[PDB]
Design a protein around this ligand. Structure first.
Ligand SMILES: [Cl-]
Ligand SMILES: [Cl-]
Ligand SMILES: [Cl-]
Ligand SMILES: [Cl-]
Lengths: 162, 162
């Protein structure tokens, strides 16, 4: 049951983020458990450097990639600017998908992209972006609720670590 | 749509808890938004002092009531002990309901009790307990996930405020 895995992964992420790991190690471990609990094969967390977004931690294909997004740039960039999420089914062939890392070639037709804002005091400080396969648009919409929760936990972690 | 209100209340709670309100005002405001967004008319957040839980904040019937729970004592005490949630339909008539606060006589048969742990580093530091009417076991299960999420946000907050 997916909901059961979602409950458990949220609990586990809270345990990690209330621990004493470094900022970078904490983010990395969150993405690792998204893989091991929820099957998220590729993901990253990008952090604001003023008006630009830079990948701070990654899992899967984004390892050893140094990428940046400007406000309005692609899916992640729009989420950064507006502080509202984007849920994009079959992203491989979506027009707004900027595929800034050539990851598209590595996706299938079922992969969706969900990008959610990370907010502190209601202001966007980062974005979490994940790729995961879905068979129908309804299951995708449900899954977004969980990724939104994780974005919020990350917002509290950003506050915690100043 | 309920899912939409749940998403919005989680965002709002994160905004409150990453702000600068006092510890007690923050907890109270969380319970206030549970009422305003999700219709939760009676609730409390209890915090661990030594090895006992004490009510730190309350809303509705629990206002101005001093109540302590020991590990294993009643429904809230069991969540405290095991660090796993309880979802009790028709709590008014449940054998494990200690009805410490005598709220029982004010509840209808439709009221459920949902109690979720508040964990820091995986250790139980408190419990959030809510009472709310439901018309079927199914919608109760969905609602439980959201209360669990709020317990996790509160865990982050407890870490934030030392
Ligand atoms: Cl840990
Ligand atoms: Cl009520
Ligand atoms: Cl009880
Ligand atoms: Cl027990």
């Amino acid at each position: 049951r997916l909901k059961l895995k979602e409950i458990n992964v949220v609990n586990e992420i809270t345990k990690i983020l209330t621990g004493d790991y470094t900022f970078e190690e904490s983010l990395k471990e969150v993405l690792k458990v998204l893989y091991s609990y929820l099957g998220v094969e590729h993901s990253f967390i990008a952090i604001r450097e003023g008006n630009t977004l830079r990948i701070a931690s990654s899992y899967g294909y984004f390892l050893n990639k140094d990428v940046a997004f400007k406000k309005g740039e692609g899916i992640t960039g729009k989420v950064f600017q507006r502080g509202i999420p984007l849920v994009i089914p079959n992203v491989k062939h979506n027009s707004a998908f900027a595929n800034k890392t050539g990851i598209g070639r590595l996706l299938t037709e079922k992969h969706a992209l969900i990008a959610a804002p990370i907010k502190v005091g209601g202001e966007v400080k980062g974005v979490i972006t994940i790729f995961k396969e879905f068979s129908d648009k309804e299951s995708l919409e449900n899954f977004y609720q969980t990724i939104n929760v994780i974005g919020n936990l990350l917002g509290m972690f950003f506050k915690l670590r100043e």
